[PDB]
């Protein structure tokens, strides 16, 4: 139980997320990812998963797990998904067909919206080509929609590729801002470093019970020993292997 838990804040509990075109990523590795704090965070609008069950996530092992946090409009929450299309799915954040993870989204009209207009959030709408899986494009150069050379400012034939969100609390459902957090899971030849909470139980001795110690399973009783195990040694084995 002395193992350090991975900080699940700064991604869900963060004040203001990164822009949709400039989404940031936190590398979660060499820790114990306690997903129990997620199920009681907020009334999420969507909690879909792909490849990994939402329940078995607290016990499966993964080499590296990434978390991407961004805020999009309420009517475009169905766009962030493997195989889907739209503005966000093509020019802001594209998921591959082999995406393995979960998608989390919840309402944020009381956080990322102001009466004067929360124009700090930006989203990409114009680009020469669609985004690749897990690709980022932070370029803010004026997209030349027309064949005429564009000037240093916006014009009739060229507009800024990044448009601002006019988030206002007076809007109804669908137009309110929604914070979206995407979780990505992967495994490779590198050994796994995150397996989730192990959820140990109380110790029972002098009884015929099943014991489990860091993966070693068996059946037998436990009694206080008088041995002199070394500080680095963990398992005890006799002559009979």
């Amino acid at each position, epitope marked *: 139980n002395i193992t350090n838990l991975c900080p699940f804040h700064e991604v869900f509990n*963060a*004040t*203001t997320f990164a822009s949709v075109y400039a989404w940031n990523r936190k590398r979660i590795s060499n820790c114990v990812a306690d997903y129990s704090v997620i199920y009681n965070f907020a009334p999420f609008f969507a909690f879909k998963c792909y490849g990994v069950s939402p329940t078995k996530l607290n016990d499966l092992c993964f080499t590296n797990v990434y978390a991407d946090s961004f805020v999009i409009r309420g009517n475009e929450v169905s766009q962030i998904a493997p195989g889907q299309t739209g503005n966000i799915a093509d020019y802001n954040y594209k998921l591959p067909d082999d995406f393995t993870g979960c998608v989390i989204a919840w309402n944020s009209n009381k956080l990322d919206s102001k009466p004067s207009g929360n124009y700090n959030y930006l989203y990409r709408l114009f680009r020469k080509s669609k985004l690749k899986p897990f690709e980022r494009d932070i370029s803010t150069e004026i997209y030349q929609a027309g064949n005429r050379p564009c000037n240093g400012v916006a014009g009739p034939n060229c507009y800024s590729p990044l448009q601002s969100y006019g988030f206002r609390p007076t809007y109804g459902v669908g137009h309110q801002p929604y914070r979206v957090v995407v979780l990505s899971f992967e495994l490779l030849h590198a050994p796994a470093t995150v397996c989730g909470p192990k959820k140990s139980t109380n110790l029972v001795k002098n009884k015929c019970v099943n014991f489990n110690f860091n993966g070693l399973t068996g059946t037998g009783v436990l009694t206080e020993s008088n041995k002199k195990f070394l500080p680095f040694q963990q398992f005890g084995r006799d002559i009979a292997d």
Partner: antibody
Amino acid sequence: QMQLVQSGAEVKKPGESLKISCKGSGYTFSYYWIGWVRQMPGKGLEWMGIIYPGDSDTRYSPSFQGQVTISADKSISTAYLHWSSLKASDTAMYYCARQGDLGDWILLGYWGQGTLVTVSS
Amino acid sequence: SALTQPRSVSGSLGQSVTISCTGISSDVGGDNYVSWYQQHPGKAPKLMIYDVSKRPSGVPDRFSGSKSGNTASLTISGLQADDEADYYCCSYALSRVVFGGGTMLTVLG
């Protein structure tokens, strides 16, 4: 301009659970987060919690999750303070703060004038 | 995390003074969640610095700041008579706000 004036000073014995109010005007007191800040004489500012008058959503500091509760009424644009099990060391100056359109939802854009709560025997 | 500030600082009218404050955290999406507040003696605190690259309306432009890792500082372009008050740094990156140990600015005369 937008104004946010609190109630007058009060003095009660420890354990009476007094109540302090605050009246705002000049803006829609529904779309702005409002909170309170406690400061004992000699120390710095201590934030207790905030509340969004648009709904029942409330957030409080870990050191003030159950020591103080904050409520608001959108129909009269009035915020309220309530304590439980007061002690002699609870006498301190209290300040209010609102979100405003200057910064984010957590940023305290404006402040009040302060209310002195004296708790002694 | 907890913010720290020097309890006593000194200056002079027309000169400049700096107030350091550490303990700023960083979150995914931004790292400029640093704000400062000025509290007159016996009065309510007043917002003077929030989002350091920006300033509130009605606040004099003599106030400024800078960011260097987890350390923030408050700089004043010129001290005056009304500047003799307390200053408190604040951080709001983790959806929570905390205040330092308080300061006390004095000017010669």
